Amino acid sequence: PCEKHSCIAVIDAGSTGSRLHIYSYDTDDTNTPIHIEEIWNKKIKPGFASIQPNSVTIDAYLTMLLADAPIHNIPVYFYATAGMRLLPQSQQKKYYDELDYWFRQQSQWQLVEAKTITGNDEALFDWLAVNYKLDTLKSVQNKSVGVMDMGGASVQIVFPMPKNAEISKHNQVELNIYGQNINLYVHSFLGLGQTEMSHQFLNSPSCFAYPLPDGESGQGNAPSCKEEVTSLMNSVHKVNQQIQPLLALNPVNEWYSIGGISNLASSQLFHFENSELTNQSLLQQGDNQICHQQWDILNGQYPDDEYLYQYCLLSSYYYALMVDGYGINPNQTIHYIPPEQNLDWTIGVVLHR
Amino acid sequence: NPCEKHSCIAVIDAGSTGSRLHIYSYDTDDTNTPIHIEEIWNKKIKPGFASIQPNSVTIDAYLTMLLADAPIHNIPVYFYATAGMRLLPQSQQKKYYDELDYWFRQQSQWQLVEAKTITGNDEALFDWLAVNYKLDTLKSVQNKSVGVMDMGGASVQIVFPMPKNAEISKHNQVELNIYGQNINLYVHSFLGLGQTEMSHQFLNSPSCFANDYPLPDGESGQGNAPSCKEEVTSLMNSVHKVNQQIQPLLALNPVNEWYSIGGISNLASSQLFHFENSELTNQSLLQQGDNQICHQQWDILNGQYPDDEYLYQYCLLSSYYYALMVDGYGINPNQTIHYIPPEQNLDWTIGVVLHRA
Ligand SMILES: [Br-]
Ligand SMILES: [Br-]
Numbered sequence A: 001p002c003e004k005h006s007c008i009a010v011i012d013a014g015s016t017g018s019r020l021h022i023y024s025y026d027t028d029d030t031n032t033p034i035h036i037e038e039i040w041n042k043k044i045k046p047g048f049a050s051i052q053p054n055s056v057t058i059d060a061y062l063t064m065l066l067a068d069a070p071i072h073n074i075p076v077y078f079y080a081t082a083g084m085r086l087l088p089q090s091q092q093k094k095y096y097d098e099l100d101y102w103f104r105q106q107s108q109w110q111l112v113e114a115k116t117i118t119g120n121d122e123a124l125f126d127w128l129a130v131n132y133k134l135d136t137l138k139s140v141q142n143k144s145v146g147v148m149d150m151g152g153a154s155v156q157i158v159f160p161m162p163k164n165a166e167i168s169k170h171n172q173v174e175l176n177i178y179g180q181n182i183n184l185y186v187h188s189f190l191g192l193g194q195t196e197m198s199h200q201f202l203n204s205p206s207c208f209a210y211p212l213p214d215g216e217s218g219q220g221n222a223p224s225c226k227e228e229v230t231s232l233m234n235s236v237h238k239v240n241q242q243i244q245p246l247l248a249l250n251p252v253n254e255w256y257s258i259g260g261i262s263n264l265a266s267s268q269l270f271h272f273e274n275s276e277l278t279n280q281s282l283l284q285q286g287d288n289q290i291c292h293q294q295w296d297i298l299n300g301q302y303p304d305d306e307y308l309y310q311y312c313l314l315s316s317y318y319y320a321l322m323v324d325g326y327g328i329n330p331n332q333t334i335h336y337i338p339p340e341q342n343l344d345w346t347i348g349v350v351l352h353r
Numbered sequence B: 001n002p003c004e005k006h007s008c009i010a011v012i013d014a015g016s017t018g019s020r021l022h023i024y025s026y027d028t029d030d031t032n033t034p035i036h037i038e039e040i041w042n043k044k045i046k047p048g049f050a051s052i053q054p055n056s057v058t059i060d061a062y063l064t065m066l067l068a069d070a071p072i073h074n075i076p077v078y079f080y081a082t083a084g085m086r087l088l089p090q091s092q093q094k095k096y097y098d099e100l101d102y103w104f105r106q107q108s109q110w111q112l113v114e115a116k117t118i119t120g121n122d123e124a125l126f127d128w129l130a131v132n133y134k135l136d137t138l139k140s141v142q143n144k145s146v147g148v149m150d151m152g153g154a155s156v157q158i159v160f161p162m163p164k165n166a167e168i169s170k171h172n173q174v175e176l177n178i179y180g181q182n183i184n185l186y187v188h189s190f191l192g193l194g195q196t197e198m199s200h201q202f203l204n205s206p207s208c209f210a211n212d213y214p215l216p217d218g219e220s221g222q223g224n225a226p227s228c229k230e231e232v233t234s235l236m237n238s239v240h241k242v243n244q245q246i247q248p249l250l251a252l253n254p255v256n257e258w259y260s261i262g263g264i265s266n267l268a269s270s271q272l273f274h275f276e277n278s279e280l281t282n283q284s285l286l287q288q289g290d291n292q293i294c295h296q297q298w299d300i301l302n303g304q305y306p307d308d309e310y311l312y313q314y315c316l317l318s319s320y321y322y323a324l325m326v327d328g329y330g331i332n333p334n335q336t337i338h339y340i341p342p343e344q345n346l347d348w349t350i351g352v353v354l355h356r357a
């Protein structure tokens, strides 16, 4: 198969698990990949950064991830993301040394790289991934496309912006693709992802329908929870100050999101059309459907939904981030990609080595 | 058998990085209160209970590994999980306890009394008891007010004497009668402000690491403790509102002496800090962190102590403890803070012995 066409394997080593993707593709007259297709996909648990960094454990792990794969003898890119970013460099190294050692003990995979990518790298790949699926990279874009990734541990935002010397180089990326020259602002906020974020608001009664950990009760009210969360976004990470002045000067024509927001907006408790939403509505539906409901009655109506308990918080969190953080209007359309299309950022690795 | 002439209990601390079994002997005084409490077995394992698969085969393996080699059998057991389990929703917790309840009923050597996730406030109560037990300040009619601060991994606790107050929630107050004396306490836990969860919000702050430390975003550490302190204070006060809740109370109910346990013991007794008499001041802690870690060259510093795996955080932690105690609790920077040394192995579980219901 990978004799007539190019293939690569990309491993997303995320906090909850590692996901192998194998892609085929051809290459157009600009030396850019086209007709990119995923031909093998496999996830295992737990996350790489949570296991013991010795040869016996990593061999098991990698063997479990790769042993059943039907395509051998291709290049492999090992990219770990937020979960490894929480470890200090010296813990990390222990993992990469064993990894380097495992790959040298065999010849079916050709390791090209193994590293922890930054959130700014991840944000670049998010952008490419989404635009590739929209088919807006080939054409000379008259419309500005912004991408927001609501991840477990970090959140990413990315949008067109011409080079700006007042602003750090780690926040900017120049690339040339399908013969076009592109300049993008990229920012990642480590610690503002929804898993990590949630840990500062578990005993906030505004954010739940609900037995809290301190034994108090839920008494949900979405606008209150928005303000709690907004404290973290803006008093701590200073999202407003870094992002709003840049969007005002470089406005975006269309917003896309990926990550958890796709899963929330397409659940049974929410109703949106055309795979898009607005903030005022998201916040409203959360407030009426979750925040002001009786937990007993709403849990009874959907046992076996293990995420429904958080939908008051996440509603309020998305609104805080997008509206009070990034400064977007509450009535602005935000498109979200549907879970079933399985778009993820790893496809951007294919486009940008 | 040892536990035939004396009373014994097992207390399992199931924290976020591991679970730790403690078996205690003790005798009982004429007030029905335990005395001469001694740890006769101690064992830890990893990882934390809340990170494993909640099914029989995994828990069986976990519990067996924890309990198999213990030389004392046939005693009551208390299984108390702390912050790590509090991060999970109830419905995930339950699965753990069902498999646990099941495991204990398939054998007869341990007599399970209780298995639950305790609240921060329960934990705070046991922190206070442990320390005062070790100080021997419970028996005697205390003229002096002792406060305790616990700097844990996922939460922080504070506790100190305060008479009942109907304007303040019930969950934050505790009445206890012990060695025949009546004691009223204020207890509070700040879930998310422990040093592990806190640090996750500051990893890309250059002010909080040694010069040239490699931050995850690829920028460089450029250390400055006062700045790092202000960044952390924002989380203490704008998010958790520690100042609002705790300074008005300490003003109207002052503490004569402060004790801390947890991570501050490990920082303050490391090679890079110098404190006498197992006590410190916040002004000196911050100053030593600033000079001995924040404004140092990372590559040389890390050369000097390779194999110290915590050093890289000492700028941040110095600043964080100062933020908490001074800008959060409102303590004076020059006030003496006593810390229990690591080598005494004092922990909170000894409080369980002293308080059952
Ligand atoms: Br709690
Ligand atoms: Br990062």
Ligand SMILES: [Br-]
Binding pocket: B287, B288, B291, B292
């Ligand atoms: Br000094």
